[PDB]
Symmetry: D2
Subunit: 455 residues, 4 copies
């Protein structure tokens, strides 16, 4: 049911291993805000699955072969090639990370007042659309928004909302379709291949462009392989290449499924767009030949993209998350379902039924997980949603979650046990989890630096 690691450990990253009593002082010193803890004081850092991947020995042999020419670097050539071969986009511009590609895609493909429609959104992506004049429309299935509904391919687009958007608004005024795989906001839910093929035939008919937010495309490809009829004899690399055939381009963040600690890229097939991309790339990132990346990082991303296609790697990655989700669900701990490709989201509202959302249950639960286990998790509730500065009132988000985001090839099943066991013991005396009040609240970006105290 749960595979052993399809790799050996080559090098370890040592941890201090501080006791509960010292962890509580550390948590207090951070103001009960896990964003303020130091990296050194944390055993298992599940804050994000972004850029904290463990690289292979081959990736580190790439790291010493960094040809750092400004232009003409063999690292750029090898990255271009790999992405062309694997994803099949004609052109490819390297960027420092996913949000660097996003910035470029939104400046090049949006006319003010056009609509951008996708399957739910991701913060940096919506920002760049919106800052360029687009109106974002969510055309995800309604079922994606029910956080307990256990259905498959929950990130698919409603073709029926897709159609009415074109009828009602006009294909002309639709900038592009932003299809994301997986759907982060629904908890890392996969998009079926049928869904992607349907979306491309509808949009093609009406002349509409489709651009993929492909940050976790390889976790998506595993779901298709695991769960869609017809892909049982297909390889992950075949599924990934078919996926990108229903798209005109994509913004990718290597920090997610590329198994690197930095790097992203923009791909497109349009030669015209590509020439415009090239001029805009030099102001924001660096020349078209390196895009704000050191050569050794283009190489390591190249080797990573290829390493991610190994079935055994992506199966264990995804099933290592599911392991954690299964163990929590088995004990009755409330989570978002079905468990996604990269994280387990605890539902803090249900976990902490005694607390109201003003007493910051997700934030407080996330503080407690650190003290009990030495595991850092991230608040994804009311604190992260911010205050409405018109009214002054918090924005009250429907989802009041603590996210357990798993970096790739860093932790073992024993580390998941540590996590699961602490959360289970906490669930068993859930009523004893206190509420938090701010003792310090920033104007902007409050989740980052807010500090709190117990009520």
């Amino acid at each position: 049911n749960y595979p052993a690691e399809p790799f050996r450990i080559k090098s370890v990253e040592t941890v201090s291993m501080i006791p509960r009593d010292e962890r509580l002082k550390k948590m207090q010193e951070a103001g009960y805000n896990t964003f303020l803890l130091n990296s050194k004081d944390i055993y298992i850092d599940l804050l994000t699955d972004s850029g904290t991947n463990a690289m292979s020995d081959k990736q580190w042999a790439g790291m010493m072969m960094g040809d750092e020419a400004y232009a003409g670097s063999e690292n750029f050539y090898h990255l271009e090639r790999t992405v062309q071969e694997l994803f099949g986009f004609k052109h490819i511009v390297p960027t420092h990370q996913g949000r660097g590609a996003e910035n470029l895609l939104s400046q090049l493909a949006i006319k003010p007042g056009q609509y951008v429609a996708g399957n739910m959104y991701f913060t940096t992506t919506r920002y760049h659309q919106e800052k360029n004049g687009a109106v974002f429309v969510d055309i995800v299935r309604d079922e994606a928004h029910d956080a307990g509904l256990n259905i498959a391919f929950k990130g698919d687009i409603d073709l029926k909302k897709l159609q009415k958007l074109i009828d009602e608004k006009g294909a002309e005024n639709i900038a592009y379709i932003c299809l994301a795989v997986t759907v982060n906001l629904a908890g890392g839910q996969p998009v079926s291949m049928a869904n992607m093929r349907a979306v491309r035939e509808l949009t093609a008919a009406h002349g509409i462009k489709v651009f993929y937010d492909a940050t976790r495309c390889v976790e998506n490809a595993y779901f298709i392989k695991e769960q869609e009829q017809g892909f049982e004899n297909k390889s992950i690399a075949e599924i990934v290449h078919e996926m990108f055939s229903y798209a005109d381009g994509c913004t990718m963040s290597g920090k997610k499924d590329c198994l690197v600690n930095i790097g992203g890229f923009l791909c497109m097939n349009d030669d015209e767009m590509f020439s415009s991309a090239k001029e805009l790339v030099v102001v924001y990132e660096g020349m078209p030949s390196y895009g704000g990346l050191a050569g050794r990082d283009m190489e390591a991303m190249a080797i990573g993209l290829r390493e991610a296609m190994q079935y055994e790697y992506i199966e264990h990655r995804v099933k290592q998350v599911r392991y954690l989700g299964d163990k929590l669900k088995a004990a009755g701990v409330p989570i978002v379902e079905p468990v996604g490709g990269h994280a387990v989201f605890l539902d803090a509202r249900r976990f902490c039924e005694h607390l109201t959302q003003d007493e910051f249950p997700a934030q407080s639960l996330a503080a407690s997980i650190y003290v009990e286990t030495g595991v850092r998790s991230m608040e994804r509730g009311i604190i992260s949603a911010g205050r409405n500065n018109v009214t002054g009132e918090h924005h009250r988000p429907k989802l009041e979650t603590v996210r357990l985001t798993i970096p790739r090839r860093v932790y073992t099943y024993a580390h998941m046990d540590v996590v699961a066991d602490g959360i289970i013991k906490l669930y068993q005396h859930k009523e004893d989890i206190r509420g938090l009040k701010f003792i310090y609240e920033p104007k902007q970006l409050r989740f980052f630096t807010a500090r709190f105290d117990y009520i």
Copy 2:
């Protein structure tokens, strides 16, 4: 006169060593544009001094100590504390490179229609200023536009122009003063400490903010020590700290004087502006704790900044460039003078008086240098100025130069000899340099991919 390397070679980058006949083929495949040459086919790459520095064995040991947490990394802490110590600014936000810092500073510091005044500009910096509504005003002394005039501290601001701008336009309508150390357009020329003090006193009086474009600020420090009376007992580290004491903040590309291959940072002292910066940095670069850089890169840049302060390193850096210029001057080759900190600029109109500027003398020279020595240099003339799209006619630039830009710690004095020697023998037969016609010209960013043939 000319110091020996104050280091030893730890590891080499192997090179091909292809012969003249093979290089001529390579330059032909490239369409005689040196920007299209492959990095593998080049022996000594002087395209740029950006990001191609050789790191130390301690930087590389820091490379293996990357703490890649999203937040709380030991490498962000070591970076932050190193800049605060060395440069003296209160806050520091890391960015993937210099232009990411510039984007951020210009969104935070300019109201549309205000004036931003500096000592000559750099492309990216001027773009970010103007893109945010600023009108750019060049207040460098008149003597820095004279490419042949050999005076010291050619980068200094004319205070007389700085006064008239305040008079004429008013200090409320001045966004900030953009002081660059050193000045790249004038050939990498230094700014005196007196000049920096003078500017801080005049702008202070009028409430005007002063932000440095500090990318080559340690090369500048060296000229201050070598040439300004009074700084003969001060250390490079004291010179740097004093310099930044006259600025409100700075944008910095670590790729230039921090001796790394990627990385930059915005600094400022204003708390209010720092908070605005943190919300904006998330969208463009990454969380404010990493700013688009892997942990290992924050580490290496921290260790780099600190190595850059060693007298003997910087003294050998600047004197190695000087050596190349000295050898060229002594054979009668025309160069920008006086020699800067980072590059030698050949004067290609002089070098090639038989050719008109429509016959693309600098590009042709840069093609000929590669063919004869295996060295790549950058065209900096009519080809890189671009055409006027309303007229259609070339922007015919006053300076028609070939830039020999020297990466820190990569080449030896024998390498300077290969360059010098080839450039001297071409000078001896300068009349045999043919002109070039376009055989393919791109709508935008023409210098990057234009290809040519001989007339």
Copy 3:
């Protein structure tokens, strides 16, 4: 019971993951000798615990700081000072590995015809002793030769035998006492602190020198802490230091408990012997300042020794082996007991009672394990004992075992499960294990290259 890894995965070694049918081909190409298998074709290599440790990110940062001077290296100084501190010996001469230390100690400490007495032997150590004229005398307690007897501190010396040797042969005719921690032939069994004190007092009385074979001395430390009354408040670092206080010097293979891939060292307190050692080390290993090791390796071994002292590391190391043994014991698989610090030994005569020891049961089992799981283990039986060349007949060894040796910090608990699970299902059909005949047998070192077929 079973601790989680007290570290995180920094970098992985990618593995093939070939299927059963392909492994069977591979095992056949190997002639069913697991020593001929390729390292690429192996998933989990338990051939040996020697030199295949995963290093830390600090060891690797030390790897980039190799000062490779012939003499005066900072890495020799950091090594020397770390051993002096941790182990407490006055002098320390680095050697390329444990047996280089042994060669040196035996040339310096034995007069031909003297007796050298220890607690069971190890091949290399016994070779170097005997090659220098020594007669080897086993003074381990009688209970350690009983492979099934589960007592603690099975490595302890019988003082009664140590007394008779002194009586019978005289202390002048005793070269030195060779005390091994832990005892590899008995299955990696520990030596109590009491036993080490007892020996030091008896040998001291008689003027007899005591040199440790300390290769797994930190695994031993752990058993002392876990099991000897009185050492419950002492640290691994205090246990180690106290242990070496009962020895005159030690030969050490860093490949085993210093967590490195190469390196060893001889220690002693005698100045006279140190001077003789320095002249002899030059001929066999290198100058006394490097002893056959690159500077980077002296560095990593210094950093390794110091990491080996962390309670949680060593406690997880020893408990990971125990875990594997526990799972095997619980299904009724016969193993040497009690489980050692570094390996589990299967009892293959038991496991395979249908086969005679001429039918090569251990080798056959080791072939079958690889086929069924992808794990390599070592034959330790009749095949590795060799033949008698006067008789021609096999040396028929009392112990007929398959050793599952676990490298430090490389595999997880899921990896232990793969092994355990395969070994348990073979045990369930133990009668189907065929015997092997030689199809090629070498004159010497037969186990290394012998090949077989099935009967």
Copy 4:
């Protein structure tokens, strides 16, 4: 005349750069013995050309791909292959360094009382022959012993002394011919290919075996290419492979021409010898599959051996030494001639004509070179030759030299200038160099730790 480096610097090793006054305290603290100085306090360490080579970026990418299996490692396979392909020996056993191979060759190929004859000797090699019963006979040309005679191929064997040795002693009692390339003792002098072909036909006729001491075989191959008629159209790899065709095997030290910091090997074509080598390899070095080397070191040696065949690399290496020799000879500084492949030997007896050999001129000159330049050199005179412990009298060596041994790819021509210039300034006031007296003299290995004072 002197080529530029055929490489770029990838990483630097920082140096402290301490002034003459502090260097003199450092020299005093070392007892005027350069063997006692620390590596950190030295600018340019010319103590030895052994193991202090700078590796390439490809070699360091090998360093991260170390497959550390005990047996079956892909690194072992790649080393075996490279050596088989390049040198052409049938079998090859890895050893920790050159003296590990020597130890094995001498145990396997000498019967007590047999003669070993070679072209002069090297310490560790003669030791291992002599310790195994051989009588060494020097059959080098007489001209090699005249240290000022500038002739080519000074390391050739006298075929006429070769013949009389067989006549007078009997081919039967000649163990093997030890042919070394280059000849270290004559100052790194080359052996012609004709000489090697002649030696093989003579020895073959009488059934006598020939084993190469090939530590600097690649510097030898350059001389043949530079100076022997007929090899102008041959490549270095062709010259090296022909060289080894006149040999039955060889001991190699990778630390010399293999461009690594550790590693050696033994090669032979005899299958019988090879089986005996295998059993003896496990006691002294480690299994036949790794020979006392970590996997990453076998890989790096593999890539190094191949990198050394680049003509441009070996030409610049050798001509970088010659540069130093030419500059010293031009000023009249007395050296051994002709300058060898790896070092310049100063003749301290002539340099210091005012001092008698009891006042230790070479030692004192070597102390002065450090104080004036920060360059460490090695005494190779009376101090290194030792005392005769029968008489108690120093052994008075004919050659009283200070050796300037150049590591490969570490220093530039500017570093050689630093060296040359300091030695020239010292020569100009040569009479002011004082004599030394011991204040501390070790029984064994005196050169290593003797300390002195000025008379």
